[PDB]
From a paper:
In the kidney collecting duct, arginine vasopressin-dependent trafficking of [name] ([name]) fine-tunes reabsorption of water from pre-urine, allowing precise regulation of the final urine volume. Here we describe the structural and functional characterization of three [name] mutations associated with recessive NDI: [name] and T126M, situated close to a glycosylation site and A147T in the transmembrane region.
[name] is located within the glycosylation consensus sequence (Asn-X-Ser/Thr) and this mutant can therefore not be glycosylated. It seems plausible that, similar to N123Q, also this mutant is kept in the Golgi, after which it may be degraded via ESCRT-dependent targeting to lysosomes or the more recently identified Endosome and Golgi-associated degradation (EGAD) pathway. Overall, T126M gave crystals which diffracted to highest resolution, (~3–3.3 Å), followed by [name] (~3.7–4 Å). The [name] and T126M-structures are highly similar to wild-type [name], with root-mean-square deviations (RMSD) of 0.942 Å (929 Cα-atoms) for [name] and 0.322 (940 Cα-atoms) for T126M. In the [name] structure, a minor displacement of the main chain could be observed around Asn 123 and Ser 124 (1–2 Å), most likely due to the larger methionine side chain.
Numbering used by the authors:
A (entry chain B): 6 to 230
B (entry chain C): 6 to 241
C (entry chain D): 2 to 232
D (entry chain A): 2 to 238
The structure:
Amino acid sequence: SIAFSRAVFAEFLATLLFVFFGLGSALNWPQALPSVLQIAMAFGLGIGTLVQALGHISGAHINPAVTVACLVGCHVSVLRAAFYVAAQLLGAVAGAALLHEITPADIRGDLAVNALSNSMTAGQAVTVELFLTLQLVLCIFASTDERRGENPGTPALSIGFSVALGHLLGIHYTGCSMNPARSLAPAVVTGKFDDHWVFWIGPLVGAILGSLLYNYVLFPPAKSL
Amino acid sequence: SIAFSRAVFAEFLATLLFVFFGLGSALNWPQALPSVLQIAMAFGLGIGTLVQALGHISGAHINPAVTVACLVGCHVSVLRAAFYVAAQLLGAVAGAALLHEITPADIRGDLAVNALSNSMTAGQAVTVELFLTLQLVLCIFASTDERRGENPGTPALSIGFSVALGHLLGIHYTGCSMNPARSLAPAVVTGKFDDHWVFWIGPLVGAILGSLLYNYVLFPPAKSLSERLAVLKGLE
Amino acid sequence: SELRSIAFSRAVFAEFLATLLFVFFGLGSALNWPQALPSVLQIAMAFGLGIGTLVQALGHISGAHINPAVTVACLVGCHVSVLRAAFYVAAQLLGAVAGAALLHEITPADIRGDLAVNALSNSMTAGQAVTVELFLTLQLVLCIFASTDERRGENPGTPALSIGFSVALGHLLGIHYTGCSMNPARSLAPAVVTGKFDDHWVFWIGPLVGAILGSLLYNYVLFPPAKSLSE
Amino acid sequence: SELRSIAFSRAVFAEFLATLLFVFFGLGSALNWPQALPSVLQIAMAFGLGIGTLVQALGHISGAHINPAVTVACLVGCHVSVLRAAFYVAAQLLGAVAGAALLHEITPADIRGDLAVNALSNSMTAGQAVTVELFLTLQLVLCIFASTDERRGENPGTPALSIGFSVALGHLLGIHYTGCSMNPARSLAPAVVTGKFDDHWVFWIGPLVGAILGSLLYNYVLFPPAKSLSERLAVLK
C-alpha cells in the first residue's frame, strides 16, 4: 500500500517536472528563438532524465497514453492505471500553473499550447499524433520488455530520443502532443481549447494500436492455458 | 513459420515510419527552415528508435543496402533478404504516400527527394553515397558482433548516430540517401527521378565494400564447423 | 591504511580538476563569439556534454560531483562524511576560480566581456529566479541519486550520459532565466574573476535548497531504505 | 614477434582507414558552407559523432586511436608497443592526407576554400592557442582511457558515445580559438593539400603535450593500474 502511494506520487512529480520543463523551454524568447531541435531536445532529454530517475520505481509513464498502452499490455491494474492517469493530469496542471506564476506577462504568450498550426485539417493532424504516439509506445515496450533482459541497453536515452524524434517532426505539424497531460495542462491554465480532442483521440488510439501490435502481433507471448 | 512473417512485417513497418518521419522533417519550411543538424537528428534518432523497438524481432535493416551487406555475415538467407528488401520498398512508398496524403497542400515541393545540389558532378555525389554507407555498414557489423566485447545487446543509439553522421555530410550534396528505399519513396510519389541511379549504385557498392572488408579483411568472424565445410566444399 | 589514504587524495584532486575543466569549457563555450553567437541549445550541449564527459572519465575515481549542491545532497542522501564533502567543495571552488582565471588569460580582452556570469535576465525577480534554480538542481540530483543508487548495481546503465543530459535539460530552461547555475562553483568562479556579484545569493540559495529537497525526496519519499525487514 | 602477424596488419590498416574516414567526413561537414553555413554545434556534432562511430566500429580491432596524440598517450600509459605505436602514427598520417585529397576531388573548387584548415583565429596568440589545444586533448584522453578501462562497467555503445561527446565538447570550445584540432593528422591533412602551414606547431605541441599530460595523470596520478590486493581485504576487515 505504501509502494503504490510512492508510485502514484512519482508519476505526479514526474509529469510535473516534464510539463514544467517542456513548456518553459518552448516559450517564444525573442533574443533566442527556440528551434525545432531545441524544443525537441528539451522534451527528449526531459523524458530520458525522468525515466532514469524513476523508471525502475514506477515505470515513468509521464503520459496517460503510455498508461493506457501499459493497461493493455503490462500486468498493471485498472486501479493503478486510474491513479496514474489522475496523478499525471494533476502533475501536468501543477507544472503549467507553477511555470505560469514564474513566467512574466511577456513570454507566457500561448504558453506553448499544442495547437493546430499551418491550418491543416483535424484529420491530418489526428493521424500524425496517432503515428507519433505509436512509435513511442513501440520503443518504450521494447526498451522495457523483460523478455529481452538487459540486452536492449540505454532504456532512458532510447525512450528520450523517441520523444525528441516525435517533436522534431510534430512541432511543425501540431507541436508533438504524444501526451494528453502535456496538452491539457496549458489548455486549462491559459484558456485555449481549439480542437483539444485531436490531442486526445490521436495519442490514445496510437497507444492502444502500438500496444496491440507489440504485445499480440509483433512479439506476442506463447499460448497460455 | 510465424516468426519469419512477423520479421518481414516488421521490416515493412520500420521502413514506413522511417520514411514518414524522415522526409516530413526535411521538407516543412514556413518561417522555420530545418537546418542540416535538425535533419540529421531526425533521420538519426528515427533509425535509432526503430532499431531499439524492432531490432530484437527482425534486425531492423530499414535499408536495402544493409540487407545486401547482411547477405554475407548476418546469417540472413537470400530468401529472407528478398522478403526484407521487398518489405522495405513497400513500406517506404507507403510512408511517402501517407505523408503525401497529410502534407499541407502546396508544401510538398521536392518532398525531400535526394537531389544533386550546388552544381556538383554526378560522380562526386555517387562517391559520397559510397562512403556514407560504408561507414554505416562498418558500424552495424561491429555493433552486432558477438566478439565486439561488452555485454550482449545491440547499441541502437550508436547505429542511429552513424546515420546522423552521414547526413551531416550527405545533406550538403544530396540528402544522405545510404538507403535506396529512402530515395525511391519520394521519387515514385512525386515523379522526380533525376540521377536516380546515384542513390542506388552508391549505397549498394558502399555496403558490399564495408561488408567484405569487415567479414574478410578487418574482423573475419569465427567460422562454425558447418560453415567451414561449405568453404572446403566450395573450393573443391 | 596507506593505500586508503592516497585514494582519498586522488578523489580530492579529481574533484578539483573536474570543476576546473567544467568551468573552463562551460564558460568558454557560452561567451558571445561574434562570428558565431552560441544558441541556447549550443550552450546547453557544451555544459551537458562537459559534465557527462567528466563523470565518464572521473566518476570511478571520485564520484565526479563537480558541484557543491550535489555534494551537499550526498551528505543528507548518499550519506558521506562531512570531511570528504568539505574537501570536495573546497576542491570545486578552487578548481572553478582557477578555471575562470585560466580562461580569462586565454580569451582576448575584447571577447572576454561578461565572462558568462550568472545574471538576472529579462527583468526577472530574485524570488522567481531562486525558484527556478531550485527545480533545475532538483531534477539533476534526482537523476544522479538514481543513476548511482547502490540498489542499481547489476546493469551499469548510462549514468554519465543521463547525468550529462540532465544538466543540459536544466540549461534548456535555466539559460533563459539565470543561465542555469545548479552549481555554486560555476557561479562564484566568474564572479570572483570578473567582479559581478549581482544577486549572487540566488545562484546559491536556489541550488542548495533544490539539492537538499531532491536528496530528501529520494532518500525519504520516493525510494527510502525500508525500515521493516518485511522486504 | 608482433610485426609479422595478421592482427598487427589489421590494426595498422584499421588506424589508416579510420583516420581516412574521419578526416573525409569531418572536414567535409565543417567546410561545406555555400547557402547554409554550418553552426558551431553542427560542426562539433560532425566531429563528435565521427569519432564515436569509428570507435564503435573499429575499437575492438585496433583500439581506434585515430590520433597520434592518443597513440602516444597509450604508449606513455604502457599498453601498445613502440613498434605498433609507430605503425599507427604512420597509418593515421597516411589516412588523413588520403581523406583530404579525396574530399578536395569531390568538393567543388568554389566551396573548397581553405578546406577547413586548423588556424589560429581572431588573432589568437600562439601561447594561448597552444594552451587551449592542450586542455582540449587532455580531457579527451582522460575520457578515452576511462571509456576503454576494463575496470569500469559499461553498456554497449556508451564508451564510443562518451568519446564521441568528448570530441564534440572540445570542438564546441576549440572552434572559437583554433577550429579545434586535438588531432595532428586532422590538421596536417588539409594543410598539405591546401598548402597553409602558418604556425602549424601549435596544432602539434598542444595536443601531444595534452595527451601525455592526461595519460600520466590518469595512469599514474588519478587511476593507476597495479594497486594492492590487501587494501580491499583491509576494507573488508
